Amino acid sequence: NPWTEYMAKYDIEEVHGSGIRVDLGEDAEVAGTQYRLPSGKCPVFGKGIIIENSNTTFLTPVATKDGGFAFPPTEPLMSPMTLDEMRHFYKDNKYVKNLDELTLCSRHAGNMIPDNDKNSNYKYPAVYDDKDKKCHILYIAAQENNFCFRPAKDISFQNYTYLSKNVVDNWEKVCPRKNLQNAKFGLWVDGNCEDIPHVNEFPAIDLFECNKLVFELSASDQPKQFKADRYKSHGKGYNWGNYNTETQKCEIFNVKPTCLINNSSYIATTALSHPIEVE
Fold first, then answer.
1. Fewer CB within 10 Å of terminal CB in the chain, N or C?
2. CA distances from 29 to 33, 70, 120, 137 (A)
3. Are residues 169 and 190 in the same domain?
């Protein structure tokens, strides 16, 4: 297979290694109590949390119901923090001050000590906003309870990225970001790229809507409505989609693709990918 190195970033089980829709792939103790927490290695582009029966945004600081998920004001203000503010804050750290914006936001979130437990290895996840270039540390790591809420790729979230404590600093190289124009995922079989044998097909008016559906069926560490390894997806799920732009059909599958097929009717997407950007 000549596609192997090219297709490496679409090996979501290997490069991300945790849930996507709900990422709770690791465990950590805080003050004698065990907590699940996000652990996936790639940024999830366009993911946010919708709070049901409410009109406060999840990026709103947590209440101290009328609050969101984000860290409450601190002295000095750790969250939210702009890109520039973060680069100044980690002035004396050679490795961190030159990190890309997403990894930096992840690391900065990871510097928050959880609840007077200086001994815990629990690290908060974060959301980075490409628009205002702001890092939001998430106080609440929970992603679905449907105070009812659910993970989603909403139009309002398209400049957001959801970031676990484990986001690698070379994600720009090893993680999916942009969708592939004029291309369809396939499987290398008997010396050439053939079509995925079994796909689930659903309607999607555009690429964004197809990305949303793949997200909904993607690797998830919690059923859509515990401690054992079996509730940890390790990135296994319906993480890939072939969007047929001509027929407005989203072809979703759960076997990892091992090559591409040129096809002007298609855009190839993953649950990690930006819901809009193409290349």
1. C
2. 5, 20, 6, 19
3. no
